[PDB]
Design a binder for these strands. Structure first.
Ligand SMILES: [Ca+2]
Length: 50
DNA sequence: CGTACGTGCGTTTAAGCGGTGCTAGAGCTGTCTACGACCAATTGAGCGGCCTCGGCACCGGGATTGTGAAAAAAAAAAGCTGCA
């Protein structure tokens, strides 16, 4: 087993983000690509501030 | 005190109206399946707890920056003399 973060080449937790989406009342369903996309965006922004 | 705006003329222009004519593309129905919820077993990433140790908070003291008053350099602006 290796994390979805490592598959996507990311530091931010794709698995955590996907759960937050499922548990945050945004939609009924969540695509696999979504949390990957999002995590990456939050990491980019984070990197740009740091 | 100067002229940029508001006013009220005429002159020009194209917005709006009503109508026709085409067709892109919105928007629908039905069929199919790939893609996500769901579950359960698995099990590592991430948590709380805790201990070091080096960066930052603080201090004192000297170096530098910056303000401001009053005293020079200079510029300037009037009164005085002669003046072709
Ligand atoms: Ca910790």
């Amino acid at each position: 087993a290796k994390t979805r973060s490592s598959r996507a080449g990311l530091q931010f937790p794709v698995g955590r983000v996907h759960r937050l989406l499922r548990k945050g009342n945004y939609s009924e369903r969540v695509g696999a690509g979504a949390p990957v996309y999002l995590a990456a965006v939050l990491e980019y922004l984070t990197a740009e501030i740091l």
